Amino acid sequence: PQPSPEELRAAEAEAASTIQRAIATAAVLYLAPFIVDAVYKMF
Amino acid sequence: PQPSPEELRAAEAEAASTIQRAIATAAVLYLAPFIVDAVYKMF
Amino acid sequence: RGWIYHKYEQTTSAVRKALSFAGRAAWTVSVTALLVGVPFSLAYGEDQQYAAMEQEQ
Amino acid sequence: RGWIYHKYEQTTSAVRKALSFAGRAAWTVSVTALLVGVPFSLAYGEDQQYAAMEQEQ
Amino acid sequence: LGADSKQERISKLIEISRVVIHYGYLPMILYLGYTRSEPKPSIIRLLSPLS
Amino acid sequence: LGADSKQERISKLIEISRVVIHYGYLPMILYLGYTRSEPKPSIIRLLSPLS
Amino acid sequence: PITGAYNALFVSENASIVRSVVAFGLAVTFLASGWAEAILS
Amino acid sequence: PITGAYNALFVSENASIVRSVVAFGLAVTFLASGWAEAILS
Amino acid sequence: LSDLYDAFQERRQKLGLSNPGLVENIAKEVQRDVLTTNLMFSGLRADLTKAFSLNPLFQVSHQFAMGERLSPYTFAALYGTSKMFAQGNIDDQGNLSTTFNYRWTPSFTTKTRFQITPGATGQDMAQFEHEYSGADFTATIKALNPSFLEGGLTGIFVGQYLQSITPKLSLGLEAVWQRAGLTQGPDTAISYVGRYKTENWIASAQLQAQGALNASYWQRLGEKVQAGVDMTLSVNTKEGITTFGAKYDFRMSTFRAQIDTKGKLSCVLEKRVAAPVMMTFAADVDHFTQQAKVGVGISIEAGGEELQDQQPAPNIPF
Amino acid sequence: LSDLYDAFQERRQKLGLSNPGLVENIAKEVQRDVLTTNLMFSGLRADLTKAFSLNPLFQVSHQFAMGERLSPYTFAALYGTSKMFAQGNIDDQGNLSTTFNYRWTPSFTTKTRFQITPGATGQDMAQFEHEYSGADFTATIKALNPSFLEGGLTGIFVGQYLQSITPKLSLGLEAVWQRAGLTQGPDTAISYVGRYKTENWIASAQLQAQGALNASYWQRLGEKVQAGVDMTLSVNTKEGITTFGAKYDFRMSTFRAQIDTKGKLSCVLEKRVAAPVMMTFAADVDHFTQQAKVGVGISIEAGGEELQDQQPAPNIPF
Ligand SMILES: C[C@@H]1CC[C@@]2(OC1)O[C@H]1C[C@H]3[C@@H]4CC=C5C[C@@H](OCCC(CO)CO)CC[C@]5(C)[C@H]4CC[C@]3(C)[C@H]1[C@@H]2C
Ligand SMILES: C[C@@H]1CC[C@@]2(OC1)O[C@H]1C[C@H]3[C@@H]4CC=C5C[C@@H](OCCC(CO)CO)CC[C@]5(C)[C@H]4CC[C@]3(C)[C@H]1[C@@H]2C
Ligand SMILES: C[C@@H]1CC[C@@]2(OC1)O[C@H]1C[C@H]3[C@@H]4CC=C5C[C@@H](OCCC(CO)CO)CC[C@]5(C)[C@H]4CC[C@]3(C)[C@H]1[C@@H]2C
Ligand SMILES: C[C@@H]1CC[C@@]2(OC1)O[C@H]1C[C@H]3[C@@H]4CC=C5C[C@@H](OCCC(CO)CO)CC[C@]5(C)[C@H]4CC[C@]3(C)[C@H]1[C@@H]2C
Ligand SMILES: C[C@@H]1CC[C@@]2(OC1)O[C@H]1C[C@H]3[C@@H]4CC=C5C[C@@H](OCCC(CO)CO)CC[C@]5(C)[C@H]4CC[C@]3(C)[C@H]1[C@@H]2C
Ligand SMILES: C[C@@H]1CC[C@@]2(OC1)O[C@H]1C[C@H]3[C@@H]4CC=C5C[C@@H](OCCC(CO)CO)CC[C@]5(C)[C@H]4CC[C@]3(C)[C@H]1[C@@H]2C
Ligand SMILES: C[C@@H]1CC[C@@]2(OC1)O[C@H]1C[C@H]3[C@@H]4CC=C5C[C@@H](OCCC(CO)CO)CC[C@]5(C)[C@H]4CC[C@]3(C)[C@H]1[C@@H]2C
Ligand SMILES: C[C@@H]1CC[C@@]2(OC1)O[C@H]1C[C@H]3[C@@H]4CC=C5C[C@@H](OCCC(CO)CO)CC[C@]5(C)[C@H]4CC[C@]3(C)[C@H]1[C@@H]2C
C-alpha cells in the first residue's frame, strides 16, 4: 500500500536526520588531522 | 502404416535393381578408358 | 497542404530505408576488411621480415 | 555372501566419486596452467628477445 | 502546490533540449574540433577512420 | 526363420566384445607403443603430456 | 526487362539456386581468367 | 574438532563469507610476507 | 575574520597533507590496474581512432563489435582543452552518451552527463556533478534526474567527501538521498571509506552502512609486477567473494591473470603487435561449469604520427 | 586364360592411367585445403601431443576444450606401422572412438571403426571398410551396423568406385543400400562423381541421383596462394550455397578466409608462435545477424625433439 500522510513525515524526517549526521561527520573528518597530529606530538 | 507382405517384395526388388545397375555402371567405367582412347586415336 | 505532408512521410520511409541499407552495407564492408585484412597484414608483414633476414645473410 | 556384494557397491560409489574429483581437479589445474602459462610464456619470452637485442648493442 | 500549465510547458522545454542534445551534440564536438584543431583537417578526412 | 536362443547368445557376445573394446582398446594401443617404440619410454612418462 | 532479373533472382522459390549458380560462375571466371592471381598473389 | 572446521566453511549459510575472508587473509599474507615477489617477480 | 583564517591555514599546511583524490578511485590500483574486470569482453571488437590534434585534443573513433552485450557500431568524438572536455558516443540504435566537463576554477569542476535512448523510453538520464579539490580534501555532489516539477525534490543526490588525515591515511564518506516521487518517502544511504597508501602497498576499505563491505589490497612486486586482492562481503542472504590477481608489464605487452573464490579464472593479454596496432586477448573460464568466454579485439590509431610534434594539452578534465 | 589377361593388361598400362584416389577425396583441395569448414571452432582449445617414436609411430595426446559442442577432455593414443594403424580417443563422458586399419596387401586395406557411448544408448556403431586400390581405380565397400540376427540383412552398405578415364579425368560411382529392419523395405541411393585434375586447377562434381549437386573448383594462384569455389545445390524446397575462399602459405603461418552466398564470413589463422607451439585463431561472422563465433586454440608437441633422428614409418594406413 501507499504511505499515509504522517508516514511520509516519518520517512522525510528520518532521511533528513541521516543526511544531517553525514555532513556532521564530514566536518569532524576535516578537523581530524589537527587531532591526529596532536596525539603523535604527545608521543 | 506398416507395409504388407507384397509391398516389401516391391521394395526388396526395386532396391535390388538399383544395385544391379550400379555394379553394371562400374563395369562400364572400368572398360571406358579403352573406348575414350580409341576416339582420340581416330582423331 | 496535406499533399505535402503525405510526400514528407513518403520521403521519410524511403530515405530511412536508404540510410539503413547504406549503414548496414558500410558495416559489413568494414567488418570484412578488418577481419580479413588485419590477420593477413600481420601474417604477411611477419613473412616479409623473415624474407629480409634471409636476404641480409 | 551378500555382505561382500554390499561392500562392493559401497566401494564403487566412493571410488567413482574419488576418481571424478581427481579427474575434475586435474582438469582445472591443467586448464589454469595452460590459460595463464601460455600467454605469459609468449609475452615473457618475447620480452627477453628484446632485452637481448638491447644488450647486443 | 505546483501549476498545471507551468509543468506542461517546463516538460516541453526538456523534450526540446533533449532533441537538440540528441541530434546536435556530436556535430557540435566535430565543429569545435574542426575549427580549433592544429592543423585543420579536411571535411571528409575529419570523419575518415584511418586515412 | 531365425532361432530365439541363437539370437540371445549372439547378442550377448556383442555386448561382451563391446565391453572389452570399451575398456581394453586404449590400454592395448599403449601396450603396443610402450613395448615396440624406439626408444622405450618410462611407464609414467608414457602418459606424461609434455615432460 | 530489369524486373525479370529481380524477381527470379531475389523473390522466387528458386532464386536461391540462381544466386549460388551466378556466384559460382563469377568466382570461377575470376580465378580462371587470371585476374585473381594478378590481384591476390 | 575437524568436523567444526568443515561445517562452518563448506555447508553453512555463512560459509561463503568465511571462505572469502580466509582467501583474502591468505592472499594478503602471501603478498606482504615477500613470498609472492620471491616467486612471481 | 581573516586573522584566524591565515593562522588556521598555516597550521593546516604544516601537516604535510595532500589531495586524496576521488572516493571512486580509492581502490583504483587493484580493481582497475591489476584486475581484469574492466577489460573483459567476449566476441570480436575493433576500435579505429583518428587523432587530429593534441592541443586542443580532438579525436574521432569508430568501434565495430560482435559479442555479448556489445553494440554492433559506436561512433565517438572527443574534444579536450586544459579547461574543458566534451565527449560524445552514439550506438547504431541511437543511444547517445555525452560528457561535458568544465574547470570553472583550477580546484572546481562541473561534470555533466546525458544518456538518451530513442527506441526505448528507458532511462534518459541527466547527471550533474560538482567536484571541489582542496589542499587536503575533495568534495563532490551529484544530482541524477533532479526534479522539482511535482512540487518537491525528486531523483538521486549523492554527496561524497574524502579527507587526508595523514600523508598516508585518507578517510571519507558517501551519502545518498533518493526519492522516486512524492508518492513515497525519501531513502538515504551512507557509505564509509578509507585508505592507507604507501609507496609499495595500498590498503582500502569501503563499508556500506547497510552491511556490504569491500576490502582491497595492492602491492608492487618489483618494477615490472604488481598484484592485488579484492574482497567483497554482502550480508544484507550472505555472500562473499575474494579475487586475487597479478599484472605483468613487458616492453611490448601487458599480461593480467586473476582467480576468485567463485572458481572463475580470467586473463587479459594486451600486445603491441604494431606501432599503431594493439591486439587484446581476453578469456574467462568458469571452473564450475567448464564454460569459457573468449574475446579478441584490435585497436588502431592513425592520427598520432603527424601530430607527435604537437604536445597533449595539460590538465584536460577527463 | 592368362593369354588374354597378359595382353589385356599390357594395353591397359599403355593408356598412362594412375590411381584416382578415394571418392571422398574427389574435392579435397577445395573443401579441406582451402576452405575453413574443417578448422572452424569456437571457445578455447588446447592439444598436448607427445610423440614417443616415429617408426613405429606412437604418440599420445591430451585435448582440453571449452566451447560449443567441444567435450571438456579427450585422451587419445595412436600406433602406426607400414602395415597397420590403430587409433583410439575417449571423452570425459566415456565416448570411445576407435580406428584399426590393416594393409592385408599393398593394394588391399581393411578399416574398422567403433563408436561406443556409455551414458546414452545412442549409436554404438561398428563400421567395416574394405578398400582396394588398383593400377587405375579404387573400389570400396562399407558395412555399418551389419546384422543378420533378424533373419535378414540390416544396416547401411555403401559401395564406391572411382575410375581414371584419362590421365586427367576420373569418373566414379557411389551406391548405398539401407534397411533399418525387416519391418520396412530396403532403401537405395546412387551418387555420381567425376573430376578433372590438372597441375594448376582441379574441377569436381558430385551428383546425388535424388537431386543434390556439389560442384567445386580449385586453382593454384602461384607458389604461396591457392583458391577454390564450392557450390552446393539441393533441389529435393530448393537451396543453393556458393563458398569462395583463398589460402595463403607464409613461412610461419597459414591464413584462410572465405565468404559464401549465405552471408557468412569466416577466417582461420594458424601461426607457428614457437618451435613446438602452434596458435590458431578462428572467427566466424554471420552478416545477417551480426553475430560472431571466436575460437582460440593452441597445439604443443613435446616428443619430436629427441625423435627427429628417427624417421617416420612409410605408408602408415591412416
Ligand atoms: C579502410 C578500413 C580500415 C583500415 C584497413 O582496411 C579497412 O586498412 C588496412 C591496412 C592495414 C595495415 C597495413 C599494414 C600494416 C603494417 C603491419 O606491420 C607494421 C609493423 C610495424 C612495426 O612497428 C611497422 O613496421 C601491421 C599492421 C598494419 C598497420 C595493417 C593493420 C590493419 C590495416 C589498417 C587494414 C584495415 C583492415
Ligand atoms: C604441465 C602442463 C603442460 C605444460 C605447461 O604447464 C602445464 O608447461 C609450461 C611450459 C611452457 C613453455 C615454456 C617456454 C616456452 C618457450 C617460448 O618461446 C620459445 C621460442 C622458440 C622459438 O623457436 C624457441 O626459442 C614459447 C612457449 C614455450 C614453449 C611455453 C609454452 C607453454 C608451456 C608448455 C606451459 C604449459 C602451460
Ligand atoms: C553451367 C554453369 C554456368 C557458369 C559456368 O559453368 C557452370 O559456365 C562456365 C563458362 C566458363 C568460362 C568459359 C571460357 C573461359 C575462357 C578461358 O580461357 C581464356 C584464357 C584466359 C587465360 O588463362 C583469359 O584470357 C578462361 C575461363 C573462362 C572465362 C571460363 C571461366 C569459367 C566459366 C565462367 C564457367 C562457369 C563456372
Ligand atoms: C581481520 C581479517 C583477518 C585476516 C587479516 O586481516 C583481515 O589479518 C591480518 C593479519 C596480517 C598479518 C599480520 C602481520 C604480518 C607481519 C608483516 O611483517 C612481517 C615482515 C615481512 C617482511 O616484509 C616478513 O618477514 C608481514 C605481513 C603480516 C604477515 C600480515 C599479513 C596480512 C594479514 C594476514 C592480515 C589479513 C588480511
Ligand atoms: C573506515 C575504514 C577504517 C580502516 C581503513 O579504512 C577503512 O583505514 C586505514 C587504517 C589503516 C591502518 C593504519 C595504520 C597502519 C600502520 C602501518 O604500519 C606500517 C609501518 C609503520 C609502523 O606501524 C611505519 O612506522 C601498517 C598498516 C596499518 C595497520 C594500516 C592498514 C590499512 C588500514 C587498516 C586502512 C583501512 C583501509
Ligand atoms: C576492515 C577491513 C578488513 C580488511 C583490512 O582492513 C579493512 O584489514 C586490514 C589489515 C591490513 C594489514 C595489516 C598489517 C600489514 C603489515 C604491513 O607490513 C609492514 C610491516 C610492518 C607491520 O607488520 C612493520 O614492518 C603490510 C600491510 C599489512 C599486510 C596490512 C594490509 C592491509 C590490510 C589487510 C587491511 C585490509 C584492507
Ligand atoms: C559426372 C560429372 C561429369 C562432369 C565432370 O565430372 C562430374 O567430369 C569432368 C569433365 C570435365 C571437362 C572435360 C574436359 C575439359 C577440357 C579441358 O581443356 C583444357 C585444355 C585442353 C584442350 O581442351 C588441352 O588441350 C578444360 C576443362 C574440361 C571442359 C573439363 C572441365 C571439368 C569437367 C566438366 C569435369 C566434371 C567435374
Ligand atoms: C555439372 C557441374 C557444373 C559445374 C561444372 O561442372 C560440374 O561446370 C564445369 C565448367 C568448368 C570450366 C569450363 C572451362 C574452363 C576453362 C579452362 O581454362 C583453360 C583454357 C582452355 C579452355 O578455355 C584453353 O586454353 C579452366 C577451367 C574452366 C574454367 C572449367 C573449370 C571447371 C568448371 C567450372 C566445371 C564445374 C565443376
Residue numbers in the entry:
A (entry chain F), B (entry chain E): 8 to 50
C (entry chain C), D (entry chain D): 62 to 118
E (entry chain J), F (entry chain I): 21 to 71
G (entry chain G), H (entry chain H): 16 to 56
I (entry chain B), J (entry chain A): 21 to 256, 265, 267 to 347
Give excerpts from the publication.
In humans and fungi, the TOM core complex is a membrane-embedded dimer of twofold symmetry, consisting of two copies each of the β-barrel Tom40 pore, the α-helical Tom22 receptor, and the small α-helical structural subunits Tom5, Tom6, and Tom7 (3). Two other preprotein receptors, Tom20 and Tom70, are loosely bound to the TOM core, forming the TOM holo complex. We determined TOM core and holo structures with and without the bound MTS of rat aldehyde dehydrogenase (pALDH), revealing numerous interaction sites with the Tom20 receptor and the Tom40 translocation pore.
By performing iterative rounds of 2D and 3D classifications, we obtained a C2-symmetrized map of the TOM core complex at 2.7 Å resolution for the pALDH-bound state. As with other species, the dimeric complex is shaped like a shallow funnel, where the protomers are tilted toward each other at the cytoplasmic side, and contact between the two Tom40s is mediated through β-strands 1, 2, and 19. On the intermembrane space (IMS) side, the barrels are separated by two Tom22 helices and a central lipid. Five in each protomer were modeled as phosphatidylcholine (PC) lipids, resulting in a total of eleven lipids in the dimeric complex, including the interfacial lipid. Additionally, we modeled four detergent molecules per protomer as GDN. Four of the lipids, one at the Tom40 interface and another three in each protomer, are observed in the same positions as in N. crassa and H. sapiens, indicating that their binding sites are conserved. The interfacial lipid is critical in bridging the two protomers at the IMS–cytoplasm interface. Presumably, owing to the rigidity of Tom40, we observed several clusters of small unassigned densities within the barrel that could be interpreted as bound water molecules or ions. We note that these densities are present at the interface between helix α2 of Tom40 and the barrel, indicating the inner helix is stable and unlikely to be involved in the conformational changes important for gating preprotein translocation.
